[model samples]
Target: QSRPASDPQVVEAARKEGRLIIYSSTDQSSAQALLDDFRKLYPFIQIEYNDLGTQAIYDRFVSETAAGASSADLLWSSAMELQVKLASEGYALPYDSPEAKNWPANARLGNLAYSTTLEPAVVVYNKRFLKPEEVPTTREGLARLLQEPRMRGRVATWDPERAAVGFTILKADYDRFPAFQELARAFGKAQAALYSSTGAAFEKVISGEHYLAYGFFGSYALLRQRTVKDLGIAYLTDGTVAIQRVAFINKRAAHPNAAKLFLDYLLSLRGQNLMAYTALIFARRETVVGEATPQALYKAVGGKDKVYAIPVSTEILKNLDPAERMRFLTFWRQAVR
Candidate 1:
């Protein structure tokens, strides 16, 4: 039998326990910022955070549950589709949050997974290293970047197999634009450097070690700009679309109530404000308007209004299993290599 959504006994017990563990694939500093902010509000509820890579978050989580070591109260990440997959597998417990109701219908997978932030996968370039004429804004534009002999060894991108957003973007290009395959082939032949994590990849470009970077989402690029002055990012002008960063609760959460509270706090306006203050602001249409997240960040990277992922039924993508994931991975690995 399912526990009540608002179980008084569990909530009180969790409050007494005073701690919630979270298994997450979110950027490390960003996750720390969130835990710190939440501590301020619920001083009694300590948060233990683990920073797993996006793909590993999904794989290890299930393994942990099966092994009875899944003590995490929440599972937080930017992998929108993976979160939905967890929920669909009955690994997530659904609760009705007042705030969730206000969220866009398209961004939620039933009551299973909800988009906590809006992010756009866009382009990043080193202004000093690359001339304005060199930055690409469309499919053809990017192809041109790789084709230029001078730009060889000057481009970097995240390996799609390691991150859901990167993988989805790869699929979006293939399904939405037939010509994208040729473009990918051209860029692949150019021998661009590919790394598993955007953090390492972005750092190279930010330090002027590279001329341009691809598959950088708006959140991380903007966060870096708050302190790093030279790095720049932009949304390709081909068609700006909204991508989602989703968070979910682990089905076997040892402290479900605490996880619920934490999730609610994350999606709340307060959390959004905290995220902005930390520089990794929420990637939503409504966010770019304020001082907390300066307009300067978006000046280079495209805003929520621009840069989007290919439309997928959040449920279909979210429910993708290991076998299904492998299918995507197999194709992407071949394409990128």
Candidate 2:
């Protein structure tokens, strides 16, 4: 299931390429260390990493490639469906990675797109900003709490239209939970603010510019909750959504071999350990033993039945359907506005 990062020939070729360009949606604050570690291992290669929105990453990659311009060597994002679309639709390089075996079969999308982390959508709040009685433990409670007069103007969530991740989380919420309408209405009437960046939303919550951020990812919550005394996350009592941060090598990657090396390093055992223990993003590999693995989260939440990790499959592309996307967003605006 494992081998060297790649053949020595690939490494030598990568060194000749001498650069890796990445388009990613993951917050750089936490991801930099992982990239820095990759650099330490391959110091000769320069990284041209761009942190962007999920949709922006996809759009830029498509446009840049179409124009015959030098584009990303790798595409990484929290938008699961978009990643799958590019991977299966000829935009991805389909080579099998040595570290691929460390992942579940579902995590590998035909050796084209690979999910590297398991992160759950959570209700993020500041402990200092909300009293014990004001905190929420369930989806129903979160909805009701949002409608509270005090919660108005003190809440934020993803702007579904602007951020693919935001749309994905809300769509999953609609499918997995029955009180979606109620939650949407509460957010609407509360006049909640919106964000296209998870990092910005989380920051506002930490600063108390907003006290709660619904549909927020656990990776940020888990990482910050450790050091920030006031930050807290509620794994909704009804059900939780586990989303993956996916990565793929671009078919037209300028530094193709170097991209291969980074992808392998990301899925490798050592990289996975850093992902779980240091980056605080739950590792996709179950072999990782620590608080940052799904096992630990499942244990904390009481059972596996409640936390559903959405699969990396072509089926999820329904989420990207223009017609369906419009209908859903229309409803969201109608309900919230």
Candidate 3:
């Protein structure tokens, strides 16, 4: 059958493929919401989505690719460094979507990888326990908060040594801020609790098992607060780490057109808007005036300079060096012990 040149050839090819698989680190609820909207646009396409941890997603893809095995057509993760590393190593296919025109230069990476969202790392707490005056606005203040006997063993955060997303955020903080070590020591002195996932840590905060959690996704906290009346979220007064959830098409994708179609839509303004509502904050500057928009998030965090957006590039790979990673982890273990 012949197709008109004016029509998108990729969409036609994708229709024939009938299926697309996505491996993402985004929480299932958000990913499902995206998939639901995508199906509305491409009804015939069958979508299989798997949500895994950031490290698991990257490791699985690398393992499957090494075995010359079939894998998901698209890979998406909040661990920007891992995505950039995979793309840099030639595991990603170059895809220059028309939607690229709408993205900021930093969001698109040489047509290989694209950052899909802007997410803030926040301090979450149980309002039922901690008073507004006691909430720490700065890292130094957080250190002070933890020093209190009441807060001892009542603070929770990610275990950077075990989780890639957590490691990235922590490592970035160590590199960017001089106060990280001071905070780490306070965490250790206070017997801070650590978890591999944000949900687990937030759960403790909600249950009052932990009075506070550090370095968690603000979007998740915000969503949870609607149902959990005692939950409260606040960005650090000193600064907060901002993450960019990145996505790319697999180099050996069996459904190339479908992958491209999905990738393009995910970067489109519509998808970005849907993301603001369902998942992390959207990356686009002109995103709607709401809690998740960059403007709102920036203001909430105090100022633009305080929102340290992680760059979508291989520059992050420096921290992943085995020796450097070991050193950082060693320091972290000591500080948090």
Which candidate has the highest lDDT of all? 2
Native-structure RMSD, model 1: 5.1
Q: State each model's CA lDDT, in order.
A: 0.67, 0.84, 0.82
**Residue 15, candidate 3: C-alpha displacement in angstroms:** 2.6
What lDDT tens digits, residue by residue, belong to model 1 across residues 207-261?
7777788767677777777788777776666654345667777777777778877
Off by over 4 Å in 1: 1-17, 161-165, 207-209, 241-243, 284-288, 291-337
Q: Across residues 65-124, which tens digit of lDDT does each residue of candidate 3 receive?
A: 999999989999887888998999989988787766666666667889987777888888
Candidate 1 CA-lDDT value: 0.67
> lDDT score of model 3?
0.82
Ranking by lDDT: 2, 3, 1
Candidate 2 lowest-lDDT run of ten: 1-10
Could you give candidate 2's per-residue lDDT for residues 82-142 as a string of tens digits?
8998898899998799878667777889788898887878788888888656677676787
Best by TM-score: 3
Q: How many backbone clashes does candidate 1 have?
A: 12
